[PDB]
Amino acid sequence: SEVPQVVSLDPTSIPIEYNTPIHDIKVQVYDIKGGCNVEEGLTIFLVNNPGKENGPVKISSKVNDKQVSEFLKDENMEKFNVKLGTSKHFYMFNDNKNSVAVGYVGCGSVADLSEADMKRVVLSLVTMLHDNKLSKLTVVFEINVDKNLFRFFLETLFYEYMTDERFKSTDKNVNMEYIKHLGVYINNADTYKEEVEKARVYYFGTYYASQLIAAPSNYCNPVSLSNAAVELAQKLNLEYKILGVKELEELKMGAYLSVGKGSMYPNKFIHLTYKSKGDVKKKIALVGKGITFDSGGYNLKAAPGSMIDLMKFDMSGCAAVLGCAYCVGTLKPENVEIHFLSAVCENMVSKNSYRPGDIITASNGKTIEVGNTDAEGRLTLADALVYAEKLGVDYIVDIATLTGAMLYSLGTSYAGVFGNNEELINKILQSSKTSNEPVWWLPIINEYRATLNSKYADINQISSSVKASSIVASLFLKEFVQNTAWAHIDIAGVSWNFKARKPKGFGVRLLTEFVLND
Amino acid sequence: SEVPQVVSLDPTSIPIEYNTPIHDIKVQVYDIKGGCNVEEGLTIFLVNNPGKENGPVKISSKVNDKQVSEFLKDENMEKFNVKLGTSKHFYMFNDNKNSVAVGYVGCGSVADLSEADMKRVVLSLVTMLHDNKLSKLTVVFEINVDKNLFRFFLETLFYEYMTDERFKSTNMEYIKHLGVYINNADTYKEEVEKARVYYFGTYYASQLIAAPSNYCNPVSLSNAAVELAQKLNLEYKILGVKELEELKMGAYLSVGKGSMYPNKFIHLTYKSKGDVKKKIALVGKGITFDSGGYNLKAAPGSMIDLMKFDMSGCAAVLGCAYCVGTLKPENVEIHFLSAVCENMVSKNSYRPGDIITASNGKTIEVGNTDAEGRLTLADALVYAEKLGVDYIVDIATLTGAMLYSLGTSYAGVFGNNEELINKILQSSKTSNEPVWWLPIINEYRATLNSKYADINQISSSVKASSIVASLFLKEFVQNTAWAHIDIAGVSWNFKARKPKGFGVRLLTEFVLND
Amino acid sequence: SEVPQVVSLDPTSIPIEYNTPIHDIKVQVYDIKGGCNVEEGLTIFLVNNPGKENGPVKISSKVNDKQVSEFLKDENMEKFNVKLGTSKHFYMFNDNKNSVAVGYVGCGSVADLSEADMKRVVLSLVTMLHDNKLSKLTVVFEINVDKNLFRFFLETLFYEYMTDERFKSTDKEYIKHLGVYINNADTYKEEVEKARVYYFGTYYASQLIAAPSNYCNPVSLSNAAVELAQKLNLEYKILGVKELEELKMGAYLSVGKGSMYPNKFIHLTYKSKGDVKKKIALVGKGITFDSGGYNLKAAPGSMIDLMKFDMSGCAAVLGCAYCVGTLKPENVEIHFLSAVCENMVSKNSYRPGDIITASNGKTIEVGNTDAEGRLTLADALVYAEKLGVDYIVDIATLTGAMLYSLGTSYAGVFGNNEELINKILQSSKTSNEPVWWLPIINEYRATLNSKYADINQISSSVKASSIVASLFLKEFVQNTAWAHIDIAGVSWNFKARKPKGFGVRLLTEFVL
Amino acid sequence: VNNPKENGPVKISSKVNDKQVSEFLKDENMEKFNVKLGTSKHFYMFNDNKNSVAVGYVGCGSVADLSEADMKRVVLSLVTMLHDNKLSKLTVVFE
């Protein structure tokens, strides 16, 4: 529980902001049919023009104000177009003679708006919120979006609006003033109202996971992260248990322990549990990769493009699980038992570090020849999957920044999912669709399995020949699940937003939807 | 057209073996429910042991021979195990006193054998043949295979058995009879002659791919297509530089600029002898050699010595053309396309940064001359859609990124139509040439937005080169069903140091089963 | 104070030779207006020939010897030329009939000789000293040199003549007298002992730099500074980890985290005895060894075996402390600062991506553990400005890019004050340690803008790292004249396989 | 506009010969925007004539004597508004 220090200035806990300015925002949903009120703050219309590519702006919604309605006519709006991402700001006086702010965001020419498109819409909106000291934002939906897409709008709005300033001292912002009220005008409002607080919950679950990932490795270490996980479970009322080295030694988790050997921070295995109240019908184990930092070990990340400075994100799998625990813990689904697992450790270079060629013994008795100390993620997950299967669970779903090859496979937008079961994979894909976190199905090719045949150990950690590292890794993971439905989500490519220089908190909504939609 | 020479010793044609020793093999299929006759040749049993991993060998089938039956009892065969690929064969005299050879090949503990599993068995079997001077091989199937897997067995057996000696010189003779004992033999008989056809289509493509680039050039390869079309009776037309200039195929022509061999656009055609109901265009990448151009393949692992294989897509199309021309399917019109050229380093070569104009008017900013395949395919796809077809399917060793994606076993398929892709995937299953569906992610498309040209050839940032290339290709098909099969990883058999002839059976099953 | 050991054979102190064979050399300066006596030893004439490139040698000086004068006539000397660096030895009997050795060194055809020219002159002369068991060296200046260049001749003569054998278990006759014949001898005499002082300050810096990282560590080096301050008479204080924690020097401490050697902040002080009118703080980068950390110097050309030199800035300041401590200037107060530590790979090491907090409250996102010098200099600079000084000047082997900028001969100087830079440049001319002024380009500053911390350690795009580093440093000086001398390129003499001791004379001329 | 402090509020010094825009360019209204170098906002409104006018600002930082890299950032910020606007006339006021 106590975080070890080298100097007295070393942080002993990960700073966590629970009460975000977003949670202070009062969200009200009105039916657009009853007319719009252009009173205080900024009012933004989400407008499209089907068919006409980059067509003119036409405000369909009825506005309950003669001066604002006259301003927003068609003859005045024709000079602006609905190009996706386009925004405009308006200044005018209403019937009361008050300075009001009005504008719009282009939502393109396509009806059924996409998901990447919506993010561009949201980002465009956030630009209008930034550098402007508003108190209320009013969004008018002159487009049709299903309940899932609507919730996604708020989730993304909250997340992109929110700025992480935990580590600013002298460069904090002077002009950061979040709105206090959010008005939403949409048709058939009563069906969308339920999605607001669902969106707010998903927001923080994602934002919580984002905060953990964003925190540097000196702040976020195996101990402080486990402490933060405990603190989260306590606030939610989840059963929690943190296993230390002695307990892990008795469980004979040789793969997991070997990775953490070179670290000054003791291994910490996180095990949170949510037990729905009543007739538990589904038992689920969520496993997340929890490497607080990945130096690569003696196979040091010294090669160009290894991006060692980024490897604080290597606990994103773990962060996704904890963010989910919040959403699950808050929303309180019924008829489900969920285990949130993460074998947390740090991959470092030391006299105590494990060496290339070292043969270790996993907790299931299988001996593993280490071919590369930088392939540690599959080593920790191996023991984690054994732990998970021992729980007697129905579904085992691991999520991990496992292979860099994912950048060459699916890239930065789509995550890859592997598995040994077609129904479990289909549920992940279905959860991917409704959670609005894109994932693509990749194959586990058994012909490659022969390249893992060790001369001395039971199985090789890595392949010498096959360069399909994403599939080979899955072949390795597949060996540590004997008779349980298992899916593997590789989020190495999608976890970090290279453009925004911040985490996505990817997986939180996907996993939560996976649990809820079951 | 005559192949140009630097010296008189430079070859002017690709040597091709049309009449292979495989074609001389008489195949006989018997039903296993009746006992085996072990008179002549070599007799091999395909045996497994479900449950018992690496279990002992048990010959279930009754053998009509007293001396061989003693050999095949349980007490002697138990000393052998069924580990996948393991084999043993002994030489002995039968009841009449003739020298026969008997043995087995291990087929593992899993029932439903895969194709890689089946391939390993065949390899094990072929090793015994490369060490055999006799006349007959008899294979006894004590394992379960559907009609497709059995046909795949023969296809693979024929393909692996055959040895390419065109470039050798300067210990065996091929068998003349093949005996097969399998259950429900009468249903599998139809697959025998189909397999032999699929065999040569693959092996033909292999010969083209295996042929060095000094032998196989844009001229000699185009000549070979003519030679193939003439033997089959396919409408053929080879477009030269002047016609390609008039068609304004600027991307395609720019790639071949640095080559001493003129560009040759291959257009073969199979028209059914009736009412064409589906019209299909098959486009194949035809780079006879890929040096990479001024973006030279000098980085480690660039494998420039391998880049004769860069015409494998074309080889697949030609191989398919063989099968289609031979099998003669009905109600279909098929166009076999390949923009053939050579990517070389010269004063005449095209440069990085060059902006070129494709035949559809779109300008392309070249970011890397080693990405020449998509440039040639760009014009090839434009040519295809003008043909007015229902399906356009390109196949090409396009991206090395496939090696990190699916590897050397599975090829990747992209497309703009889900039904066409499903037809390809269904075709992958029956041909047993494995393909996995990969996504065209439209979010990446913005990275192809050039500052000066209409579209970028490559992305500066996004390293998912396999998806970006597909995004590029998609720009040259406007309103036609199009699929893209990336076979860069699967085309060459690195362990065996030879081509796979990948795509031939995949594409042929696609046209036939459609 | 006590140096930690892994094995008992690990050294606990930097061997230092204070009394070099150079110091036992009795130096005599005579005015040439009166003739040279070719009595004993080797006598070498420094000769020029204006206009002709490699023209003949003509010895102008009067020699108080009939036979040597006849030998040194024009008809005999014409077969030799004055090509810059050329040397010749002569054998002859003098008037009393004693075997004396005489010769010359070519000084080219150009009047105002440069420094590379003079070094070649000095080096060529040293060659005659190394293969000869001589007892006396007499140098006659038949060329024109200002008082400053003359001192440099002696400086370079002393430094190159001297051989460092501290780490030899083998070995293998320094001269005891040095005679100098020059016109206006009475003005050059004052430069004689000044050169000897500048010499050792330089040679002192060389010894510290040349000393391997197992000998010269944060503790042993800090001990040497204490030892140095004591042999002088400077107020000294070495801050250890506990007080540095209370001063909250988080950037500096993070770099030393992975080391077996505790951080040691060197703070020597020279306070004049009168009305201190200028207060100066000299900060030196003090990395006793630079492994690069988790961003290990594993790439080809990283020259990791050289990274013992990464304390050259500190060695320069200490060398300055010696010269200043010896010459004792008036009306000046000088603080000699150096945040000494070791950048190593360990479980305790700081990681890439780590956010640390400097002593001025600014949070820093570490992008590369091999950019540790600016991290240590940041806290050192905050400490420096707290002293309330007029000038803050740091000197450091900070960026390897300097080899691509100015190379190995010229050092780069950056700053936020133009008058301070001109004084540094002015010192470069008189110290004869070449320095070129480089710009701090504010357009690059945006590349140091961190997403989470106050400021980034490194830039993502811009490869002008020497400038980027300077932009980082500028953030830790709020309202004080500050100059930064990047000596990564000039610190090591790659051809001679030894340190240059660069910066010592430059800084001393700046103070004095 | 600049604010000699750092990322401080926007204050329009210039007198505007328009009652409606002057109301917009008031201190109470421009205070919500800051002068960070390159930051910009433009609004659309009707003037006294009831014509659609577009008004805005570009932040020129807190330093007086603008550099050359500084001016480019200002210009780019200005150019972005031109590329996203079907305007006919651009008016730049140098405060």
Ligand SMILES: Nc1ccc(C(=O)N[C@@H](C(=O)NO)c2ccc(-n3cccn3)cc2)cc1
């Ligand atoms: N021989 C091998 C095979 C696979 C790997 C591999 O997949 N490494 C992982 C890793 O570090 N696991 O702990 C990996 C490397 C880079 C990235 N990466 C993700 C964004 C950028 N880079 C992700 C995962 C390494 C070495």
Ligand SMILES: Nc1ccc(C(=O)N[C@@H](C(=O)NO)c2ccc(-n3cccn3)cc2)cc1
């Ligand atoms: N900037 C880029 C982007 C993509 C590529 C690329 O995919 N290149 C292709 C190619 O050169 N096609 O002609 C490629 C590279 C490697 C391989 N390869 C296949 C088996 C081994 N290597 C195949 C194709 C090259 C440069």
Ligand SMILES: Nc1ccc(C(=O)N[C@@H](C(=O)NO)c2ccc(-n3cccn3)cc2)cc1
């Ligand atoms: N991404 C970066 C950017 C700059 C540096 C850098 O400045 N490295 C310095 C250094 O060691 N700082 O502590 C550096 C590197 C090489 C040399 N070098 C000097 C003689 C030869 N090489 C000197 C300094 C390192 C990594």
Ligand SMILES: [Zn+2]
């Ligand atoms: Zn790793």
Ligand SMILES: [Zn+2]
């Ligand atoms: Zn990892």
Ligand SMILES: [Zn+2]
């Ligand atoms: Zn290429």
Ligand SMILES: [Zn+2]
């Ligand atoms: Zn190619």
Ligand SMILES: [Zn+2]
């Ligand atoms: Zn360094």
Ligand SMILES: [Zn+2]
């Ligand atoms: Zn350094």
